[PDB]
Amino acid sequence: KHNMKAFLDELKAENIKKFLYNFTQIPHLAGTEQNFQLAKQIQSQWKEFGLDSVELAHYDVLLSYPNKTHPNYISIINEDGNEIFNTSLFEPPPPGYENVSDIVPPFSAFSPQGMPEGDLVYVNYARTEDFFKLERDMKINCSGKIVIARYGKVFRGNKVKNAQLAGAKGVILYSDPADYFAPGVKSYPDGWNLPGGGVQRGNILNLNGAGDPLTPGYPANEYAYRRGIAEAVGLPSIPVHPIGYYDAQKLLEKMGGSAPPDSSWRGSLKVPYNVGPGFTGNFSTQKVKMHIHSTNEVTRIYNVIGTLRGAVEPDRYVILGGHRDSWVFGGIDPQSGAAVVHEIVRSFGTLKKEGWRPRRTILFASWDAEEFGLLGSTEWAEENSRLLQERGVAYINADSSIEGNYTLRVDCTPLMYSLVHNLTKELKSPDEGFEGKSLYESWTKKSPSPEFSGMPRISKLGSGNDFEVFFQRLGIASGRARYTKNWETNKFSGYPLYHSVYETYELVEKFYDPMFKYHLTVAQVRGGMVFELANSIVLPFDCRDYAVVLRKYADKIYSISMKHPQEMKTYSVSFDSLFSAVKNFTEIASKFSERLQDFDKSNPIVLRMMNDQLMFLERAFIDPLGLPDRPFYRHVIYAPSSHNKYAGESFPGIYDALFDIESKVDPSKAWGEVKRQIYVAAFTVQAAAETLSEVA
Amino acid sequence: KHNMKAFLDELKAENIKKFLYNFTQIPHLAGTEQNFQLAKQIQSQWKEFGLDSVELAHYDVLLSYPNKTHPNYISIINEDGNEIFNTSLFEPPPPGYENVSDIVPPFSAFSPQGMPEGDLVYVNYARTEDFFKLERDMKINCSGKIVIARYGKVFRGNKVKNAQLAGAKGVILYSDPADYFAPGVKSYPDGWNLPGGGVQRGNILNLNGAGDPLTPGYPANEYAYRRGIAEAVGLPSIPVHPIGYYDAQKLLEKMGGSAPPDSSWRGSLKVPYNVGPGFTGNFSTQKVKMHIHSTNEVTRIYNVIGTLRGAVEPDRYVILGGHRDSWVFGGIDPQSGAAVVHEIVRSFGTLKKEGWRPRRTILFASWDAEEFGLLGSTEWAEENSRLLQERGVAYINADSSIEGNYTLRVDCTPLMYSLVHNLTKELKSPDEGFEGKSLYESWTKKSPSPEFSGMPRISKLGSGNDFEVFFQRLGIASGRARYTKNWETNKFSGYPLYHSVYETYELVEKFYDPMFKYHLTVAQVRGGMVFELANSIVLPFDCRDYAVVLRKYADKIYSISMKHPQEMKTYSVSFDSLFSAVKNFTEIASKFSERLQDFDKSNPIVLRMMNDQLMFLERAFIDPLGLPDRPFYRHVIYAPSSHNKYAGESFPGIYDALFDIESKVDPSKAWGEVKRQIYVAAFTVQAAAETLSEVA
Ligand SMILES: *[C@@H]1O[C@H](CO)[C@@H](O[C@@H]2O[C@H](CO)[C@@H](O[C@@H]3O[C@H](CO)[C@@H](O)[C@H](O[C@H]4O[C@H](CO)[C@@H](O)[C@H](O)[C@@H]4O)[C@@H]3O)[C@H](O)[C@H]2NC(C)=O)[C@H](O)[C@H]1NC(C)=O
Ligand SMILES: *[C@@H]1O[C@H](CO)[C@@H](O[C@@H]2O[C@H](CO)[C@@H](O[C@@H]3O[C@H](CO)[C@@H](O)[C@H](O[C@H]4O[C@H](CO)[C@@H](O)[C@H](O)[C@@H]4O)[C@@H]3O)[C@H](O)[C@H]2NC(C)=O)[C@H](O)[C@H]1NC(C)=O
Ligand SMILES: *[C@@H]1O[C@H](CO)[C@@H](O[C@@H]2O[C@H](CO)[C@@H](O)[C@H](O)[C@H]2NC(C)=O)[C@H](O)[C@H]1NC(C)=O
Ligand SMILES: *[C@@H]1O[C@H](CO)[C@@H](O[C@@H]2O[C@H](CO)[C@@H](O)[C@H](O)[C@H]2NC(C)=O)[C@H](O)[C@H]1NC(C)=O
Ligand SMILES: *[C@@H]1O[C@H](CO)[C@@H](O[C@@H]2O[C@H](CO)[C@@H](O)[C@H](O)[C@H]2NC(C)=O)[C@H](O)[C@H]1NC(C)=O
Ligand SMILES: *[C@@H]1O[C@H](CO)[C@@H](O[C@@H]2O[C@H](CO)[C@@H](O)[C@H](O)[C@H]2NC(C)=O)[C@H](O)[C@H]1NC(C)=O
Ligand SMILES: *[C@@H]1O[C@H](CO)[C@@H](O[C@@H]2O[C@H](CO)[C@@H](O)[C@H](O)[C@H]2NC(C)=O)[C@H](O)[C@H]1NC(C)=O
Ligand SMILES: *[C@@H]1O[C@H](CO)[C@@H](O[C@@H]2O[C@H](CO)[C@@H](O)[C@H](O)[C@H]2NC(C)=O)[C@H](O)[C@H]1NC(C)=O
Ligand SMILES: *[C@@H]1O[C@H](CO)[C@@H](O[C@@H]2O[C@H](CO)[C@@H](O)[C@H](O)[C@H]2NC(C)=O)[C@H](O)[C@H]1NC(C)=O
Ligand SMILES: *[C@@H]1O[C@H](CO)[C@@H](O[C@@H]2O[C@H](CO)[C@@H](O)[C@H](O)[C@H]2NC(C)=O)[C@H](O)[C@H]1NC(C)=O
Ligand SMILES: *[C@@H]1O[C@H](CO)[C@@H](O)[C@H](O)[C@H]1NC(C)=O
Ligand SMILES: *[C@@H]1O[C@H](CO)[C@@H](O)[C@H](O)[C@H]1NC(C)=O
Ligand SMILES: *[C@@H]1O[C@H](CO)[C@@H](O)[C@H](O)[C@H]1NC(C)=O
Ligand SMILES: *[C@@H]1O[C@H](CO)[C@@H](O)[C@H](O)[C@H]1NC(C)=O
Ligand SMILES: [Ca+2]
Ligand SMILES: [Ca+2]
Ligand SMILES: [Cl-]
Ligand SMILES: [Cl-]
Ligand SMILES: [Zn+2]
Ligand SMILES: [Zn+2]
Ligand SMILES: [Zn+2]
Ligand SMILES: [Zn+2]
């Protein structure tokens, strides 16, 4: 039989390992020749594996690279202007790659050039609340200071935006061992910890979903009209550079001014973590100087797009997508995911060669330039937005397959909760101690849901990966899954070797997944989801699971507002309409579910009608006017947090209207905007509910 | 048989006449009790006629009304401040209606209150080119002047916007006999001409598609959050009032300053048409004073929405819609159209009662508050936008059925050209001299197309009626048809009694259509279109007809640009991408047409696929970011002219970027924006073409 079991049994751990080795021997930086060669290889292999067509889709987008003959670095400079200490020009390469060429040195992609000189202020994680504490409570002014911040807790672009708004003239990012050195584990190559010379690369844009900074709204094709740099979306206005903790120790050890306000501000290095500004008395005339010479340049990128045409509904698309570009070797990010996609394509192609076809069309994508702001996925979706809007059933992301070896992690739309529960109950757990038990059982045991008991945790989608354009711009049901570390020990900073030269095939093979069993489990979960989405007669979405979460989010946002009972009285701020809409959604969704079970199974138009209502339900939460000042975040239920792009926020328009509202100087205006966002949310929920009513 | 002939033969001229009489005995002003009573009547009758459901959908929107105890009027005031001449407080009522109550007096809906006093400037039709001529050529400054403009040529809202931007402090609109008195025809009640005491009502908003001024984007339902007046969309900032030509003669006869610049500026009254400013020497100290006391008020309106559920595709909607609210009796506008819709509903209901159902669902709408800015249609479409986006096949408008008695007029999307040609070839001409000939033959003979010979004229959709939200906001294929006057004699100002108290049942029965044969012909054309759209197995749209017009519009916009060859050289302004896209569209559309003819007729999914490609083709021309500063005009091929809302403009984004470009002070920026709009248009055309490619 050609069923899901046939598909699943064809997936092999050993193939995933061979592909991972193959994809991680040389760097595949976006816009470089090596990454175009790899694209051409994947295109040729997907063709051999049996897909119907495999094409490259290219775009010319703004990228950013250090200047090879003028390297970036930071100094301590004395009153004469002698540079008495210099940060490193490169990470020490790992064993056996010390002769690899074209390792891009650590830098912050999209930083402007400059050589600012000044006194340091230490700003902890440079979160919105860190700056509140500095400015409001401690009275420290960052205006014209260079700020130093530890990586972790929030996306680095938000840190840089927050420093810029505080008036900083430069930002230094570093990895603290508190956040990137796990107790009792050795540094690479002897374990999976970050060495003191290790540095995390990463872009520092604030794109808010725009894609290529120069062409928001439209694909960066051959005739595209580009904004000038000064009108580009999302570029930082102050120089930024990342360093490791050996160098950070040298910059921090002399810090003076105020003490850290409390222990949440202290990392693990042997320094006081003083906030500053500037250095202690003896060194008070030394300053810090950055030298940044990176350049932004329009550069061609390439996505690989494979198609496996559907037998029954070829005009319905189920998409499995993940990126291919890496900062260096990409041993975890992204190639642990790309190897998994490669083996999924191979398995589907095996079934195809024997004459099977899925019911719906399956699109496979190897995206480029994800590391530079989701550019490949977003330019392609801009180009194909009309096809995706009217035909896109679901998007499953496929970046890193592992970030730990403890249990499953799934983030997805409520529409996929039931599908995920059911599929995982049919898969074998790879975990020690759960031999012969289901993945569902191990996952539920190790990662209990906060709400439900007997159920596993499934998180909201945030952002910082290639599903953003599909989910929050276009409203296509989306999900992601990988193996992860313990939620109980999770400091939310990323695995220690994230975006460092030490993320290699050996890291994975030696320390994360030597038998490739977690990789195989993730290939079964991602591939299983794609299979069910592309092949189930009725789309495997349960609208009633959205009803349950909508009530939870409505409770949550009401609770936030209720911290201000006096203002809700004064301005007549009612959540009645939103609760009403969520009640209606629950009632209509219950009735639609009854019809979906009871409908005449013989009638295909009835079937295509009800599958269209399921497909367009995520679509209904899109507001074409977008959220305030963020036109590409159009989903009313979920947006990336305005304070941390990685995190999802629910009822984002109402959340942001309420955030810090006690500080607004015109409360009437502020609470008016809260009411406006309540109206928009209640309306959108009711309208989405009405798409599930009988059609006529 | 229940086929189109059965439907068409059931329509009766005599029923349309009875309904028109019934709908025109009392005024049905939006927001009044009389118009709610009529809504309730139509709801009850559509139920009796056999529709499956008939509901009222209500909204609370901003309307505008004179103050009953403080009437509007204009004076000539002498240096003491005695008002030596006053304009009329009402139109003389026609014979037999002199005792009708609640005739709203002439006023400009949405005018602010004020009593500005000043010197007059005469501005011809207050068109963009009229103001260019005054300011640039004649050096007349309108700043702080009251301007007087004759109605005609362009929508009155554009006149008021243009006066406001010239710095006027008030605007007086009047009907010139040059534009509203046909040679040789008597004034009402003895003929169809406008008497000197006649006045044209009408709103003066510039909504640009927004709907209710207080709730742009969202329906004005019970919990809606409303903008304050100062942030409302589209309201004029200077007082405005309309008058007839007896009163206008009194205001104009004393005009001094400059002579009219040429004869295109002179109407037919016995006055010099001097431009001013102010009056001749002896009267130079007399001024003009307005007194406007109308108020804007949120008021409930009611749409009637009837549903005839489809037998095969109930989730596909074909909509026949026209408004019900009138300025006074609405003998032509809108009730000549509403009577036609009433008889169409009756005929469909007859077939339904015998067991027939159309293939697709048919929605019938009686919209409210069209006269106040398309408010009823637009609030409903805002409420139901997700259903309409994913399910709307077509919208046929049904305002006035007649504006003359000469020949057919059709304005529609190219997608409906073939349907209209074919249907009219099967209908009988009602015209004298074409007895036993087809409507197609009479229409082609009397209204030849400028491009084609052997073909009839079919115009672009403009705006100023209830299809605007469906076509230019949501991208649903739309059309309209009515009987019209001779294009050769057409001065484009409207029929003479437009929006006057003299537009009555008698006007129509005595002077326009005594046998109701033109009404019947229009019921056959509108109803015939709805029938074919709701019942044809393959949707009756021909994508190749869009390809032909796209090439015509691309030629036209290129020709405009080519008036500036030096700048196109300097700034490298190329139309190559747009011509390329139009070529591709033509090629793909030709191939799609071959498949549509050759496809396996047995396969319904193949059928639903190809009907979806046809339905979403108009949808593909929507840009979700909208046109510059006009977020509700989202169609890239057609928008209402920025200088005249009634007229359609093709490639509007490129047209406006080119308009008056030789006057822009930064030509580099201006031609940059031209290039941007070329890129957007070429991209949208290519993307729409790609929706017709094979799907996978
Ligand atoms: C959840 O679904 C429910 C039930 O299906 C839906 O209920 C609707 O509630 C609205 C809003 O209250 C009702 O609106 C009323 O409609 C009647 C005519 O049917 C009007 O007379 C009412 O207006 C009067 O009263 C108002 C309130 O006091 C006054 O402000 C006003 O001036 C009038 O005097 C009012 O408009 C509507 O009838 C029901 N519909 C149905 C089918 O029951 C509810 O709105 C849904 N929730 C959301 C968030 O959409
Ligand atoms: C109408 O349809 C046609 C044909 O189907 C479609 O043609 C496409 O044209 C584009 C734009 O010219 C082609 O793009 C080229 O693609 C190749 C790789 O296939 C690139 O090497 C080319 O780039 C080089 O040359 C450029 C131009 O001189 C340089 O600027 C650049 O730096 C590179 O050196 C170029 O990107 C594309 O291959 C074809 N596609 C096909 C299938 O033939 C055309 O674009 C359509 N019109 C519109 C408006 O979409
Ligand atoms: C990764 O695997 C690919 C595919 O097996 C290798 O590319 C092949 O290399 C052989 C021998 O050099 C060529 O003859 C083939 O044409 C290549 N095939 C394709 C599709 O490119 C590649 O060498 C491997 N890379 C590494 C680093 O091992
Ligand atoms: C840090 O790097 C800087 C720049 O390379 C060094 O300063 C330079 O030293 C060279 C060699 O002595 C001089 O010729 C240049 O004039 C100096 N350049 C600048 C910009 O100051 C500096 O010596 C290094 N400091 C340490 C401690 O290694
Ligand atoms: C792979 O799994 C092992 C086993 O759980 C992890 O190591 C254990 O984890 C905790 C530290 O959080 C310790 O208390 C145990 O003592 C560890 N056992 C052993 C044998 O080391 C290991 O951390 C995982 N590898 C990765 C990269 O996460
Ligand atoms: C997940 O599996 C459950 C249990 O099989 C499915 O729920 C059943 O669906 C069948 C088939 O329609 C119904 O007749 C049963 O009554 C359902 N059982 C329960 C407890 O609800 C569910 O539909 C599956 N979810 C998905 C998305 O496929
Ligand atoms: C317009 O026609 C309607 C429907 O025939 C008339 O309304 C009916 O009036 C009768 C007698 O007064 C009532 O008993 C019915 O209940 C009404 N029916 C409905 C559906 O409203 C109405 O009187 C006519 N109006 C005019 C001006 O002639
Ligand atoms: C035009 O109308 C105005 C306002 O009604 C007239 O002026 C008023 O006349 C009455 C009666 O004489 C006075 O009591 C008011 O004081 C006047 N009001 C104002 C605002 O001036 C005026 O007489 C009328 N002019 C003509 C020629 O009929
Ligand atoms: C109804 O049709 C008649 C016949 O065409 C129109 O009157 C004629 O039209 C032109 C004026 O444009 C004259 O040259 C003829 O002499 C007229 N003939 C007659 C008998 O009047 C009439 O204008 C139409 N009615 C309306 C309201 O448009
Ligand atoms: C308008 O009528 C024409 C002529 O009947 C239709 O074109 C024909 O369609 C048939 C049926 O598919 C084809 O086999 C013929 O070859 C077509 N003839 C020509 C000359 O094209 C046309 O499809 C109708 N248009 C609409 C929208 O229904
Ligand atoms: C990089 O720096 C060098 C050497 O100082 C300079 O000549 C060149 O302009 C720079 N390259 C780029 C791409 O900016
Ligand atoms: C911070 O410094 C700058 C001037 O050096 C000033 O404009 C700004 O107001 C200061 N703010 C505070 C709160 O000290
Ligand atoms: C209309 O004018 C009267 C009488 O001068 C005034 O008392 C009333 O306020 C006005 N009515 C409205 C609705 O503005
Ligand atoms: C028109 O009048 C006002 C001042 O009365 C002035 O601001 C404006 O510049 C004038 N413009 C011209 C062109 O005369
Ligand atoms: Ca873009
Ligand atoms: Ca609205
Ligand atoms: Cl992922
Ligand atoms: Cl119309
Ligand atoms: Zn990644
Ligand atoms: Zn990454
Ligand atoms: Zn009308
Ligand atoms: Zn009208």
Curated annotation (Swiss-Prot), chains A, B:
<dbReference type="GO" id="GO:0006508">
    <property type="term" value="P:proteolysis"/>
</dbReference>
<feature type="glycosylation site" description="N-linked (GlcNAc...) asparagine">
    <location>
        <position position="67"/>
    </location>
</feature>
<keyword id="KW-0106">Calcium</keyword>
<keyword id="KW-0645">Protease</keyword>
<feature type="binding site">
    <location>
        <begin position="645"/>
        <end position="646"/>
    </location>
    <ligand>
        <name>substrate</name>
    </ligand>
</feature>
<comment type="similarity">
    <text>Belongs to the peptidase M28 family. M28B subfamily.</text>
</comment>
<feature type="active site" description="Charge relay system">
    <location>
        <position position="612"/>
    </location>
</feature>
<dbReference type="GO" id="GO:0005737">
    <property type="term" value="C:cytoplasm"/>
</dbReference>
<feature type="binding site">
    <location>
        <position position="156"/>
    </location>
    <ligand>
        <name>substrate</name>
    </ligand>
</feature>
<feature type="binding site">
    <location>
        <position position="379"/>
    </location>
    <ligand>
        <name>Ca(2+)</name>
    </ligand>
</feature>
<feature type="binding site">
    <location>
        <position position="498"/>
    </location>
    <ligand>
        <name>substrate</name>
    </ligand>
</feature>
<dbReference type="GO" id="GO:0004181">
    <property type="term" value="F:metallocarboxypeptidase activity"/>
</dbReference>
<dbReference type="GO" id="GO:1904492">
    <property type="term" value="F:Ac-Asp-Glu binding"/>
</dbReference>
<dbReference type="InterPro" id="IPR007365">
    <property type="entry name" value="TFR-like_dimer_dom"/>
</dbReference>
<dbReference type="InterPro" id="IPR003137">
    <property type="entry name" value="PA_domain"/>
</dbReference>
<dbReference type="GO" id="GO:0016020">
    <property type="term" value="C:membrane"/>
</dbReference>
<keyword id="KW-0224">Dipeptidase</keyword>
<dbReference type="GO" id="GO:0016805">
    <property type="term" value="F:dipeptidase activity"/>
</dbReference>
<feature type="glycosylation site" description="N-linked (GlcNAc...) asparagine">
    <location>
        <position position="141"/>
    </location>
</feature>
<keyword id="KW-0325">Glycoprotein</keyword>
<keyword id="KW-0472">Membrane</keyword>
<dbReference type="InterPro" id="IPR007484">
    <property type="entry name" value="Peptidase_M28"/>
</dbReference>
<feature type="binding site">
    <location>
        <position position="399"/>
    </location>
    <ligand>
        <name>Zn(2+) 1</name>
    </ligand>
</feature>
<dbReference type="Pfam" id="PF02225">
    <property type="entry name" value="PA"/>
</dbReference>
<keyword id="KW-0963">Cytoplasm</keyword>
<dbReference type="GO" id="GO:0005886">
    <property type="term" value="C:plasma membrane"/>
</dbReference>
<feature type="binding site">
    <location>
        <position position="370"/>
    </location>
    <ligand>
        <name>substrate</name>
    </ligand>
</feature>
<keyword id="KW-0597">Phosphoprotein</keyword>
<keyword id="KW-0479">Metal-binding</keyword>
<feature type="glycosylation site" description="N-linked (GlcNAc...) asparagine">
    <location>
        <position position="99"/>
    </location>
</feature>
<feature type="binding site">
    <location>
        <begin position="463"/>
        <end position="464"/>
    </location>
    <ligand>
        <name>substrate</name>
    </ligand>
</feature>
<keyword id="KW-1003">Cell membrane</keyword>
<feature type="binding site">
    <location>
        <position position="215"/>
    </location>
    <ligand>
        <name>Ca(2+)</name>
    </ligand>
</feature>
<feature type="glycosylation site" description="N-linked (GlcNAc...) asparagine">
    <location>
        <position position="584"/>
    </location>
</feature>
<feature type="binding site">
    <location>
        <position position="382"/>
    </location>
    <ligand>
        <name>Ca(2+)</name>
    </ligand>
</feature>
<comment type="function">
    <text>Also exhibits a dipeptidyl-peptidase IV type activity. In vitro, cleaves Gly-Pro-AMC.</text>
</comment>
<dbReference type="GO" id="GO:0006760">
    <property type="term" value="P:folic acid-containing compound metabolic process"/>
</dbReference>
<feature type="active site" description="Charge relay system">
    <location>
        <position position="574"/>
    </location>
</feature>
<feature type="glycosylation site" description="N-linked (GlcNAc...) asparagine">
    <location>
        <position position="22"/>
    </location>
</feature>
<feature type="binding site">
    <location>
        <position position="203"/>
    </location>
    <ligand>
        <name>substrate</name>
    </ligand>
</feature>
<dbReference type="GO" id="GO:0009986">
    <property type="term" value="C:cell surface"/>
</dbReference>
<dbReference type="GO" id="GO:1904493">
    <property type="term" value="F:tetrahydrofolyl-poly(glutamate) polymer binding"/>
</dbReference>
